[PDB]
Each structure stands twice: as C-alpha cells, then as structure tokens.
Amino acid sequence: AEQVAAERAARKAANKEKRAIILERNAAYQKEYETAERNIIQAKRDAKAAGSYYVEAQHKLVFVVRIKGINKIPPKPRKVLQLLRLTRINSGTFVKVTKATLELLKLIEPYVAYGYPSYSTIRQLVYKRGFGKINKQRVPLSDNAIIEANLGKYGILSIDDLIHEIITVGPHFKQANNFLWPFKLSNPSGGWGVPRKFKHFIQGGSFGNREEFINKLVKSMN
Amino acid sequence: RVKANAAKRAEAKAQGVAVQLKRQPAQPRESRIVSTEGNVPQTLAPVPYETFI
Amino acid sequence: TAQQAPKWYPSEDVAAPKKTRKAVRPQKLRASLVPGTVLILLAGRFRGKRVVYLKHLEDNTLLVTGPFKVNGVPLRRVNARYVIATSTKVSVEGVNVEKFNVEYFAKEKLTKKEKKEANEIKTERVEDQKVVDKALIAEIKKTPLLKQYLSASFSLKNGDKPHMLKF
Amino acid sequence: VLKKNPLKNKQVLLRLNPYAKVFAAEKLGSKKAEKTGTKPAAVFTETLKHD
Amino acid sequence: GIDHTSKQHKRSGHRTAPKSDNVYLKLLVKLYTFLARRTDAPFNKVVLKALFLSKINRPPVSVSRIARALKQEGAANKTVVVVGTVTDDARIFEFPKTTVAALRFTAGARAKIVKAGGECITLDQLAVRAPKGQNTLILRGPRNSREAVRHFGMGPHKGKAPRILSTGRKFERARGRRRSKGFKV
Amino acid sequence: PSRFTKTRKHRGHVSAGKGRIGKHRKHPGGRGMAGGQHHHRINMDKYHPGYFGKVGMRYFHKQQAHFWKPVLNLDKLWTLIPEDKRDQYLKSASKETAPVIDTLAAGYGKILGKGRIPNVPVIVKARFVSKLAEEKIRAAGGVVELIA
RNA sequence: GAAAUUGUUGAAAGGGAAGGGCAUUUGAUCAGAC
RNA sequence: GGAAUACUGCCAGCUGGGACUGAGGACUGCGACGUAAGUCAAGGAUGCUGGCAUAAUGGUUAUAUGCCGCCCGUCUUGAAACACGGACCAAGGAGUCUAACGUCUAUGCGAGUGUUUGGGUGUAAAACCCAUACGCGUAAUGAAAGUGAACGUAGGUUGGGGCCUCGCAAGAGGUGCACAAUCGACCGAUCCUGAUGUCUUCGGAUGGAUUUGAGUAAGAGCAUAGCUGUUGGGACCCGAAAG
RNA sequence: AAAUAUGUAAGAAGUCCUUGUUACUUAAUUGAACGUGGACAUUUGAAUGAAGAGCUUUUAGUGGGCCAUUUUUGGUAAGC
C-alpha cells in the first residue's frame, strides 16, 4: 500500500475534469449573457424603426441594503427586516421581485435603499464579500468545492455558477440566495451623495428605489 | 383546488411533464411592443389655477 | 514548599517555521535613473552635493562618483531613495566600472573591545578613482559650465517649492 | 487562515474561474459590436421633438 | 449594533458531563463518548446521553417490565440494557433466561435473573459484546409515578393533589371542596 | 455551610438581594396565617380548597387501635412464606399438604384481592378478607380460615 | 508601634480651589536583555 | 450628409505614489507557468544593510501642554442640586441558628427503608455491632357505619427514541420503553335497579348513570447531605408614641 | 362607507373508493360516529425566514412610573 501516487493521480484526474466542466459553463454563460444583452439593445432599434415602443421586461431581481440603524423601529418593519436578514446597518441581500415581496419592500422603504443590480455589481459582491451558510456557520467561499458540496444538488458547482442563479432567477434561486450569507458592506467610499439620508431618493434623500443608481452606491460600499 | 390539484397530477402522469401543482404569486410583467397606429401620443401639460366658485 | 508545582509542563522543543513563500526578485529602479545621470544627494556627509551615477550595484544601491577631482566625492554607493535624479546627463560609456561590487566595499567590522576614545585610506582605492575620473572629466569638458555645476552645492532658496521645481 | 481576494491577486482569480485566462487573452471586456444602419420612424422623431 | 433575533449566549440547556463525582461513572461515560464519536451508531448516542441523566430521570426498572419487554413479538432473545437501576418484583413467579445490562441491580434482582438461568452484566461488557448495540433494547422506567408529579400544576378544576402534611377528615375537605359547604373547587 | 450561600456573594451590593424599592421589611403581609378569608384569598382558594369550615361529625376519645387493620394484598401473599421454603410448594400443587399463611403473625388485619396468585392451593388465616379476594384464593383451590 | 494630625530637611507646582482621564515633552529613578 | 466630443455604463485593461497590519509555524489543500525537471505573488514576511548594545528604547513617578472631567451614597418619573447622611482616621459593625416543610441535586439500599430511644462493646462524648418495636411507603374512597383496586397478552387508536429484517443507498415492513393526546376496563362514594333465597325483613345478584375521588392499570420509596424558598421564632441591624 | 387594524384556510391528522359495528336516528342498511381493505410521496400543494423545536419545575425583583410623533377627553390654558 504505497498510497502516495495511486489515489493522488486519481484525485488530480477528478480535479482536472471538474475544472474542465466548469470551463464550458463559464463559456456557455458568456454567449448567453452577451446574446440577451444585445437582444434588448437590438429589439429597441426595431421598435423605433417600426414606429413603436419596446417595453422591456419588468425587473425580476433587486438588491436591498439596510440604511437605518437598529434603534427605534416599529414592530412591523422590524419583523420584515428580519425576514430579509437585514439586522444591521449596511447589510445586503438579494430579493426576488414578486407581489409577495413588493409589499414587504414598501413597509421597509424608510429604512432601506434598493434597486436593480447589474452583472458587474453582483459578480464583484460574491467574489469579494460572498459567504456561504455552512452548517449555520459563515464560511468564505474561496474554493469551488465549498459551493460544490453544499449547492451541488441543484446543479451549482462554482462561484461563477452561483452568480448565474442569482442574476437569472432560476428554479433554485431560493436555495442559492439562502446559501449566500447576507452581505456585510462598509459605508460608501465617496459618501452618500446627499446631505441628508433619511428622505426618499426622489426627495433628495437616500432611501427608496433607485432603479440603477444602486450599482454606484453598492460599488462604493463594496 | 384539491380537486383540480388531484386531477392535474392524474393527467400529467400519463406523460410526466412536471405539471407544477403549486401556486405562484403575481410575477413581474414581461416585455411587449406597444405600437402607435392611430394611437399617436398626445402631450399633456399642468393646468393653471382657477377658483371655480 | 512555597509554591507547590504545575501539574503539566510545556514542551521545551522549538518548532520549525512553516515554508515561507516570499521569493527574492530584482529591484526595479525608477525610469529617471539612467547611468551617467547627475544626482543630487539628499542625506549623509555629501548632502546637497552633485554627483554622477555610474552603476547599479547588486544590493539595490547605486555606484556613484563626484568626480573626486571636481567636488571631492569619491567612488561611493548610495540608495536610490536618498538622491534626486536630474535631467543632466553625462556620457558614461568608456568607463571601466564592472570591477566594483558589494565585496569591493568591505568595512572590516570592528569588535566591541576596540572602543576608540578620541580617534588610513586603503591602498588602491586612490588609483581606481583616478582611472575612472580621467575618462569622466574629459566627457565633462564637452558641456560648458558643467564642471562648475558639479562643483556647487544644491540648496533650497527662499520661496522655492520642490513640488514645482524641475531637476 | 486568511481571505485573499479575487478582482485582484490574479492567482486567486484563476483558482475560482478557469475562464478568466481566455476571457483576458481574447479581450472580451473590450469587444466590438457589428454596426447596424437602422433609423427610427418619422413618427418617433416628431413625437420626441413635439412640444 | 445588531438586532438580535434570539437570545445571546444561551447555553444548550442539555446535560453533558454528569455532575456526580463518582469516578467509575466517569469511566463509563468516557468509554461511550468515544464509542458514540467513532461508531456512527445511534445506540451509543442514547446510552451516553442516558449516562448523563439525573436520578428522577432514571426511574427504577423492575424485572416485570423486563419480562413484558421480552414477551413482545421477536424480542425474547434481545439483550436488555437498562441505563439505571434494576429492582425486584415479587409479583411474578416465573422468569425467562435473558441477560441484562445495567448500572445497578438489586440483590433480589441479581438473585432473580441468576436463579432463572440468566447473567447480569455491566455496561462495559455490553460494549465488548454490542459495540453498535446489536440485538439490544432500551427500557425506561415510569417517570410520572413519583409522588411529587401528582402535585404539579394544581389549581381550580384540575384535581392535582394539594401539598398536605396530615390528611384525613377536617383537613382541607371542607368549603371549597363541596357544594354543600360553599362552592366546590 | 456558610461559605457556599449567596450571602457571601451579596457582600458589596447594597440591598443584599432584596430590592431598592421593595425595601425588605419585617412582616409586610401579616404574620402566620393571616388573611385567609381576606387579602390572601386567591392563594388559599387555588392551593388550599377546604381550609375553612367543617365537613362531618366529631369523635371523642379516639385511640387508633380499634381501626388498626393493616392490609396485605393478594398480589404477594408469599413474602410471608420463607424464600428457600417457597419453591417446593409452587411446583407441587399437592393436596392435604398445602401451606398455612397466618396473616396476623405477619401483622395484617385484612386481605384484599389485588390479583393473580399462582394456582397452587394454600390455606390463609385472616381476620377479614375482601369478597373478590376470597374466591380467587378458593378458585385456586385453597380456603380462607377466619381468625380472631 | 499603623492612620488621621504635626515639626524639620529635600524635591516640585501654584493669576478666584484642588484632585482625575487620553497622549506626549521635560526632570528624577528603574527592571529586563547583552 | 459625414465625423468628433460630452454624459452614463463595462473591461477576469495597463500602470505610479502614500498609509496601517506580518496573526499562523515541518508536509498535506486549491491553483498558475512549464515536454519534463522544476518554479510561484498558490491554505497569513521574508531578504539585504546600518547604528547602538547603553537608561539609547521601554516602565514608574512628578510636572508642563492640548482636549475633556460637577460629589459620593440614598429615596425617586426626575439629583451636581438651594432634597437627606458624610470634618478626619483606626477598630468593631448588620440575612444567622433551630423545629417543621416545597422544588432541584448527589449518595446508598430498594418493596422496602432508617445502627446511634435503648442494649452490647470500646484505644471511651469517637469507631464497631444488635433485637423487639416504631414512623414513612407498598391502598384508596366515603361525615360515617363501611367496602376495597385485572373481561382482555393489564386494553384499543395515534405519535414516538432505541432496536430487528430487507435494502449499495434512499427508503420499506416489524417491535415499539419513557412520554403526549384520547377513548374503554377496574376500586371507592352519590343516585338508581333489585336476583337466588329468607327470623318477611334481612341480604345484595346483576345491569346502569351528562355524578364524583388528592385512586388501579407489573410498585418507588426511605434515609442522609447541599443551594435556594416558606412558616414560627429577637429572625438582617438600629429605631417609637405606649402597656 | 374607507385607511390602518382584526378571525379563518392554503393537505398525509388530506382526498377518493368499498363495506363492519351500534342500545342513537330514519318509512327504509336511511343516516351519525368510529374502524377494516385499496389508490394517490417529493412542486406534498402560496411567499420569506427559522437564530434549533416542544415541555416542566422552582424561585427573585417589580406591582409610585414618566416623555415623544400620531389619535383623543376635561380645562381659557398650563412644564395641568
């Protein structure tokens, strides 16, 4: 039983094939991410050239950051904040946009800032601040096998695959998002952009729906 | 709902299509094309003040 | 007994350190440092003097000369972050410089017993200066006032700002 | 024992993404799109320029 | 700060490392904490937890329940193991031959099974015979038979055994306990 | 022992575990059993129903020897028989040899039919017996012999 | 042979209190290590 | 008609300057570059060099400077308070013991339990041994006179840890202690019913009931010790006007 | 006749099929309740979260409260 090159050559072969499989799906998502990103661009030209208006699909995903501290919050908003796992200032969570989630977002509007996040924002978050809930323990991802052993049931094998299930809300988004620990962000690097935070974004403040300006805000936090 | 829920599974097992017996909430809308044939936009402006009394 | 005992004793053996993963790579000098450049020293005996940069020594230091005939600065080595690289260039080609290295500058470390209370030059370091300077002073004569420029001391005047000056 | 970060430390990036090597070598971040010459309808321009 | 959804620094509320200073019980626990760690068998998890338990959570199993246990379908050959104490029941005049594993047997019980052809064993001898608890069954004595539980929860209209030193007539069997004398309970 | 009580841990702390507002006082609610039909009613009613009033009839000059009648149940009936002297009777259901169990010599005034004697015949000498007790002994084959 | 309180010598500071905390300059003193 | 620039966004685009940190201590893991060897910025700092080797760094203390700092304890919604006690210091100074008890715990023996009222004995107020008794538990329910705890594998249904069989596994079937819910059976009481019969007024068979018990349904108890709580006690300490 | 609040449900203890019991009920094996046997298992029956869940014993202190936005009563008002 030499057992220093027999199984080691076996484990390396099993590692190479996993790296091999991870490679096509990253390439596969690339043409899938490119094609769709160019379809809406091109479908807008066709509408204008045909004398019509292309009404894009309503956004399916929002990123929510808790803006207020933990003091002096009425019962109903405090419960809804807990159900989204935002239990301290500058915390992040992805929420699937649905009727049962919109009404939660209205109750918490004075306390959160949210919008529609792009690929660059979400890709950077998981790479820098992505943690998995591993047996009720907050574990840095830092390897594909960590996601593999915990989200391999649903076909998720990598950190890049996990981002895919987030941005395109798939059949296993609920488990995938739940696996992702709530993001602990810092304060924005360049500031909040306003003198007073706790007014609505429409009213010169910070809280509410900032439809794409969340990307600028989260990147300064990230 | 049980009757339809029991009925849909019974018909589905003849072909196995994963009938998805669960209920879904109201989803965000998907894309569409709105055309302006005879529906050309008309511009509205804020109205001035009047007392009406 | 005044203090009874500890029930257990830490092991006296030392642990080997883990495998360090910090390799040594060559230093990258800034672009303003080209051999033959005139340097403005910032610290030491010869702070404020102007000297000629000859060679990059292997221990990250710059081989430098006054020349000794011009301003009295011999063949030394200095650190790149204690000099200012000027735009003035003196052609260093034609100077035999490959013999100088770290082993050339050996201090013959002194023991603790030899404590000097109140109070020479090594034999052939007076001819190496002459050999190099002879090929270097000839190149100095080409540019007018250059020999005068090297013989002066740099200083900041009233109202000059290093963040705006050029050298 | 220590969290090293992707988006830097290129070695860590290749560990988590085998596609990073070909993403960079192909310059997919600065890719160019083929030009198209379609133009908006006359009704669109008048509406945009309407009072 | 954090908005805690649960109380912080809450201990498990379960008992580990039983608080008795008996040296021999500690050795039994040590043998079974190793066993539960390294055998991946749910039987050694139970025994290790049961070795922790207190006296009122170890009611005395009698030889009659053991006899009834062995009269279950296909259980007359299983090894009986009691984490606790085994007492004698002079209310049965027959007995099977099955061996018993326990902490303490009474002399009457030790006499009983030995007379009936059995052999009473300790818990370690069980380990070297049933490391995964093969062919065993756990018997737990009646916890709610103690005289203190009768008194637990008493109030109006539940009949729950008042604490009383001397009983009989003219001891809290009066107004409050009948409709003839005031209200009843 | 004194070194373990919480009095050692209440040194340095003003109220000594009695409160600052409550201000532990001598007998704030009355001494002994005060307030039974008054401010302590809810406690007495919930825990001591029957504490006030009377229920029956009196009995002067009671001595608890006329009602002395310790009970032996029919479950055992056999701890009185000696241990090594038992098994030869249980295995031999022999007539005209059956044991006599004098419950009084044991100290029992009554026998009641708790249950399930072995079917060997035995003679029992009892001051009193229960109804179902007497035939269960007799249905086994024995007989009960009243004694005084 | 303690403390409160007191005398003498020595040192230091002091424009309507004094005492305290963080940080360091200065003065006095000092352990470790070699 | 052809470009540019702005603005917004993206690059797993390149690159310069500054600051803080170096936890870990043989290898293992994941990777990257290489035909291979091997190398690396890859599961946490190393290499070269200088001065000093001493109060130089550092500790202590006193002072100075910048900023800050209201008097403690107590009652209280609220104290720095123009609310109360405290001029200063030493020594003493306030939740204890007992009889009876509740929960929890630990120990022994266990249908029992408890030597220590007393007796024997003794190295003598100890240690050791012992019968008859005695209290508590094993039987309760009725004011009482009284009666007195199995239709049945000591019941059925449901949930159940553990165990057993099949199964690679997932899972399936069997047995199912403690415990939970529930319905039935048994004992006592109240209201019925009233059998064979007999001192013709006794006795109480059997079948019942929106009645009821601090019950049975293969015993858990007894002892000693401990924290905490209770009652009586001077009852944490100090405190009347009185009789 | 709102808004904000408030009760119930969103399954396996469910649904469907056949038939055994009875001293109740019906003209009527008609029903009512409880069961026997069979079929439907991981999208098993909306969302999100779950930090473990359910349970018991015992015992402390407290039982003078006060303030702010909104609602509101007495009062001219009030640090009422």
Short mmCIF file of all heavy atoms in Angstrom, two decimals, chain I residues 39-50:
data_model
loop_
_atom_site.label_atom_id
_atom_site.label_comp_id
_atom_site.label_asym_id
_atom_site.label_seq_id
_atom_site.Cartn_x
_atom_site.Cartn_y
_atom_site.Cartn_z
P A I 39 -52.50 -0.19 -2.55
OP1 A I 39 -51.43 -0.86 -3.33
OP2 A I 39 -52.24 0.23 -1.16
"O5'" A I 39 -52.99 1.09 -3.37
"C5'" A I 39 -53.33 0.99 -4.75
"C4'" A I 39 -53.75 2.32 -5.31
"O4'" A I 39 -55.04 2.71 -4.77
"C3'" A I 39 -52.84 3.49 -4.98
"O3'" A I 39 -51.70 3.55 -5.81
"C2'" A I 39 -53.78 4.69 -5.13
"O2'" A I 39 -53.94 5.02 -6.51
"C1'" A I 39 -55.09 4.11 -4.62
N9 A I 39 -55.33 4.42 -3.20
C8 A I 39 -55.07 3.62 -2.12
N7 A I 39 -55.40 4.16 -0.97
C5 A I 39 -55.90 5.40 -1.32
C6 A I 39 -56.42 6.46 -0.55
N6 A I 39 -56.51 6.42 0.78
N1 A I 39 -56.84 7.56 -1.20
C2 A I 39 -56.75 7.59 -2.53
N3 A I 39 -56.28 6.66 -3.36
C4 A I 39 -55.87 5.58 -2.69
P C I 40 -50.32 4.16 -5.24
OP1 C I 40 -49.23 3.74 -6.16
OP2 C I 40 -50.23 3.83 -3.80
"O5'" C I 40 -50.51 5.73 -5.38
"C5'" C I 40 -50.90 6.31 -6.62
"C4'" C I 40 -51.39 7.72 -6.42
"O4'" C I 40 -52.61 7.71 -5.64
"C3'" C I 40 -50.47 8.65 -5.65
"O3'" C I 40 -49.44 9.19 -6.45
"C2'" C I 40 -51.43 9.70 -5.10
"O2'" C I 40 -51.75 10.65 -6.10
"C1'" C I 40 -52.67 8.85 -4.82
N1 C I 40 -52.74 8.42 -3.40
C2 C I 40 -53.36 9.27 -2.49
O2 C I 40 -53.83 10.34 -2.90
N3 C I 40 -53.45 8.90 -1.19
C4 C I 40 -52.94 7.74 -0.79
N4 C I 40 -53.04 7.42 0.50
C5 C I 40 -52.30 6.85 -1.70
C6 C I 40 -52.22 7.22 -2.99
P A I 41 -47.94 8.62 -6.35
OP1 A I 41 -47.24 8.95 -7.61
OP2 A I 41 -48.00 7.20 -5.90
"O5'" A I 41 -47.27 9.45 -5.18
"C5'" A I 41 -46.00 9.08 -4.65
"C4'" A I 41 -45.21 10.27 -4.19
"O4'" A I 41 -45.86 10.86 -3.04
"C3'" A I 41 -43.78 9.95 -3.75
"O3'" A I 41 -42.94 11.06 -4.04
"C2'" A I 41 -43.93 9.80 -2.24
"O2'" A I 41 -42.74 10.02 -1.51
"C1'" A I 41 -44.99 10.86 -1.93
N9 A I 41 -45.78 10.57 -0.73
C8 A I 41 -46.57 9.47 -0.49
N7 A I 41 -47.16 9.50 0.67
C5 A I 41 -46.74 10.69 1.24
C6 A I 41 -47.02 11.30 2.47
N6 A I 41 -47.82 10.77 3.40
N1 A I 41 -46.43 12.49 2.73
C2 A I 41 -45.63 13.02 1.81
N3 A I 41 -45.29 12.55 0.61
C4 A I 41 -45.89 11.36 0.38
P U I 42 -42.25 11.19 -5.49
OP1 U I 42 -43.10 12.08 -6.32
OP2 U I 42 -41.94 9.82 -5.97
"O5'" U I 42 -40.88 11.93 -5.20
"C5'" U I 42 -40.48 13.06 -5.97
"C4'" U I 42 -40.96 14.35 -5.35
"O4'" U I 42 -41.73 14.04 -4.16
"C3'" U I 42 -39.85 15.31 -4.91
"O3'" U I 42 -40.30 16.65 -5.08
"C2'" U I 42 -39.73 15.00 -3.42
"O2'" U I 42 -39.19 16.06 -2.65
"C1'" U I 42 -41.18 14.71 -3.04
N1 U I 42 -41.33 13.85 -1.86
C2 U I 42 -42.40 14.08 -1.03
O2 U I 42 -43.22 14.96 -1.24
N3 U I 42 -42.48 13.25 0.06
C4 U I 42 -41.62 12.23 0.39
O4 U I 42 -41.82 11.56 1.40
C5 U I 42 -40.53 12.05 -0.52
C6 U I 42 -40.42 12.85 -1.59
P U I 43 -39.68 17.57 -6.25
OP1 U I 43 -39.87 16.85 -7.54
OP2 U I 43 -38.32 17.99 -5.84
"O5'" U I 43 -40.62 18.85 -6.25
"C5'" U I 43 -41.29 19.27 -5.06
"C4'" U I 43 -42.76 19.49 -5.29
"O4'" U I 43 -43.03 20.91 -5.36
"C3'" U I 43 -43.32 18.89 -6.59
"O3'" U I 43 -44.67 18.48 -6.37
"C2'" U I 43 -43.30 20.08 -7.53
"O2'" U I 43 -44.20 19.99 -8.62
"C1'" U I 43 -43.66 21.22 -6.59
N1 U I 43 -43.20 22.55 -7.02
C2 U I 43 -44.07 23.32 -7.76
O2 U I 43 -45.18 22.93 -8.08
N3 U I 43 -43.59 24.55 -8.12
C4 U I 43 -42.36 25.08 -7.82
O4 U I 43 -42.07 26.21 -8.22
C5 U I 43 -41.51 24.23 -7.04
C6 U I 43 -41.95 23.02 -6.67
P U I 44 -44.98 17.15 -5.53
OP1 U I 44 -43.77 16.30 -5.55
OP2 U I 44 -46.28 16.60 -6.00
"O5'" U I 44 -45.19 17.67 -4.04
"C5'" U I 44 -45.93 18.86 -3.77
"C4'" U I 44 -46.34 18.97 -2.33
"O4'" U I 44 -47.27 17.90 -2.01
"C3'" U I 44 -45.20 18.85 -1.31
"O3'" U I 44 -45.49 19.68 -0.18
"C2'" U I 44 -45.27 17.39 -0.90
"O2'" U I 44 -44.73 17.12 0.38
"C1'" U I 44 -46.77 17.12 -0.94
N1 U I 44 -47.13 15.72 -1.21
C2 U I 44 -47.50 14.93 -0.14
O2 U I 44 -47.53 15.34 1.01
N3 U I 44 -47.83 13.64 -0.47
C4 U I 44 -47.82 13.08 -1.73
O4 U I 44 -48.15 11.90 -1.86
C5 U I 44 -47.43 13.96 -2.78
C6 U I 44 -47.11 15.22 -2.49
P G I 45 -44.95 21.19 -0.14
OP1 G I 45 -43.69 21.24 -0.91
OP2 G I 45 -44.98 21.65 1.27
"O5'" G I 45 -46.04 22.03 -0.95
"C5'" G I 45 -47.31 22.31 -0.37
"C4'" G I 45 -48.25 22.95 -1.37
"O4'" G I 45 -48.49 22.00 -2.44
"C3'" G I 45 -49.61 23.34 -0.81
"O3'" G I 45 -50.10 24.60 -1.29
"C2'" G I 45 -50.53 22.20 -1.28
"O2'" G I 45 -51.87 22.58 -1.47
"C1'" G I 45 -49.87 21.78 -2.59
N9 G I 45 -50.07 20.36 -2.93
C8 G I 45 -50.27 19.87 -4.19
N7 G I 45 -50.41 18.57 -4.24
C5 G I 45 -50.28 18.18 -2.92
C6 G I 45 -50.34 16.88 -2.36
O6 G I 45 -50.52 15.80 -2.94
N1 G I 45 -50.16 16.90 -0.98
C2 G I 45 -49.95 18.03 -0.24
N2 G I 45 -49.79 17.85 1.08
N3 G I 45 -49.89 19.24 -0.75
C4 G I 45 -50.06 19.26 -2.09
P A I 46 -49.49 25.39 -2.56
OP1 A I 46 -50.32 26.62 -2.65
OP2 A I 46 -49.43 24.53 -3.77
"O5'" A I 46 -48.01 25.80 -2.14
"C5'" A I 46 -47.75 26.94 -1.34
"C4'" A I 46 -47.69 28.20 -2.16
"O4'" A I 46 -48.88 28.99 -1.89
"C3'" A I 46 -46.53 29.14 -1.86
"O3'" A I 46 -45.36 28.82 -2.59
"C2'" A I 46 -47.11 30.50 -2.21
"O2'" A I 46 -47.13 30.69 -3.61
"C1'" A I 46 -48.54 30.34 -1.73
N9 A I 46 -48.66 30.64 -0.29
C8 A I 46 -49.06 29.76 0.68
N7 A I 46 -49.08 30.28 1.88
C5 A I 46 -48.66 31.58 1.67
C6 A I 46 -48.47 32.65 2.55
N6 A I 46 -48.68 32.57 3.86
N1 A I 46 -48.05 33.82 2.03
C2 A I 46 -47.84 33.90 0.71
N3 A I 46 -47.98 32.97 -0.22
C4 A I 46 -48.40 31.82 0.34
P A I 47 -43.93 28.81 -1.88
OP1 A I 47 -42.93 28.37 -2.88
OP2 A I 47 -44.06 28.08 -0.60
"O5'" A I 47 -43.64 30.35 -1.55
"C5'" A I 47 -43.42 31.28 -2.59
"C4'" A I 47 -43.23 32.68 -2.05
"O4'" A I 47 -44.39 33.07 -1.28
"C3'" A I 47 -42.07 32.88 -1.09
"O3'" A I 47 -40.83 33.03 -1.76
"C2'" A I 47 -42.48 34.12 -0.31
"O2'" A I 47 -42.21 35.29 -1.06
"C1'" A I 47 -44.00 33.94 -0.24
N9 A I 47 -44.46 33.39 1.04
C8 A I 47 -45.11 32.21 1.28
N7 A I 47 -45.40 32.02 2.54
C5 A I 47 -44.92 33.15 3.18
C6 A I 47 -44.91 33.56 4.52
N6 A I 47 -45.42 32.86 5.53
N1 A I 47 -44.34 34.74 4.81
C2 A I 47 -43.81 35.45 3.82
N3 A I 47 -43.76 35.18 2.52
C4 A I 47 -44.34 34.00 2.26
P U I 48 -39.58 32.13 -1.35
OP1 U I 48 -38.66 32.08 -2.52
OP2 U I 48 -40.10 30.87 -0.78
"O5'" U I 48 -38.88 32.93 -0.17
"C5'" U I 48 -38.63 34.33 -0.27
"C4'" U I 48 -38.50 34.95 1.09
"O4'" U I 48 -39.81 35.07 1.70
"C3'" U I 48 -37.69 34.17 2.11
"O3'" U I 48 -36.30 34.33 1.96
"C2'" U I 48 -38.24 34.67 3.44
"O2'" U I 48 -37.66 35.92 3.78
"C1'" U I 48 -39.71 34.89 3.10
N1 U I 48 -40.57 33.75 3.51
C2 U I 48 -40.94 33.66 4.84
O2 U I 48 -40.60 34.47 5.68
N3 U I 48 -41.74 32.59 5.15
C4 U I 48 -42.19 31.62 4.30
O4 U I 48 -42.90 30.71 4.72
C5 U I 48 -41.76 31.78 2.94
C6 U I 48 -40.98 32.81 2.61
P G I 49 -35.30 33.16 2.40
OP1 G I 49 -33.92 33.54 2.03
OP2 G I 49 -35.87 31.87 1.94
"O5'" G I 49 -35.36 33.17 3.99
"C5'" G I 49 -34.72 34.19 4.74
"C4'" G I 49 -35.21 34.20 6.16
"O4'" G I 49 -36.65 34.15 6.18
"C3'" G I 49 -34.79 33.02 7.02
"O3'" G I 49 -33.48 33.15 7.54
"C2'" G I 49 -35.87 33.00 8.10
"O2'" G I 49 -35.61 33.98 9.08
"C1'" G I 49 -37.10 33.43 7.31
N9 G I 49 -37.93 32.30 6.87
C8 G I 49 -38.06 31.76 5.62
N7 G I 49 -38.89 30.76 5.57
C5 G I 49 -39.36 30.64 6.87
C6 G I 49 -40.28 29.73 7.44
O6 G I 49 -40.92 28.82 6.90
N1 G I 49 -40.45 29.97 8.80
C2 G I 49 -39.80 30.94 9.51
N2 G I 49 -40.09 31.03 10.81
N3 G I 49 -38.94 31.79 8.99
C4 G I 49 -38.77 31.58 7.68
P A I 50 -32.59 31.85 7.82
OP1 A I 50 -31.26 32.31 8.28
OP2 A I 50 -32.69 30.95 6.65
"O5'" A I 50 -33.31 31.14 9.05
"C5'" A I 50 -33.29 31.74 10.34
"C4'" A I 50 -34.19 31.03 11.32
"O4'" A I 50 -35.54 30.99 10.80
"C3'" A I 50 -33.85 29.57 11.59
"O3'" A I 50 -32.83 29.42 12.56
"C2'" A I 50 -35.19 29.00 12.05
"O2'" A I 50 -35.44 29.34 13.40
"C1'" A I 50 -36.17 29.78 11.17
N9 A I 50 -36.52 29.04 9.94
C8 A I 50 -35.98 29.19 8.70
N7 A I 50 -36.50 28.39 7.80
C5 A I 50 -37.45 27.68 8.51
C6 A I 50 -38.35 26.67 8.13
N6 A I 50 -38.45 26.19 6.89
N1 A I 50 -39.17 26.16 9.08
C2 A I 50 -39.08 26.65 10.32
N3 A I 50 -38.27 27.59 10.80
C4 A I 50 -37.47 28.07 9.83
#
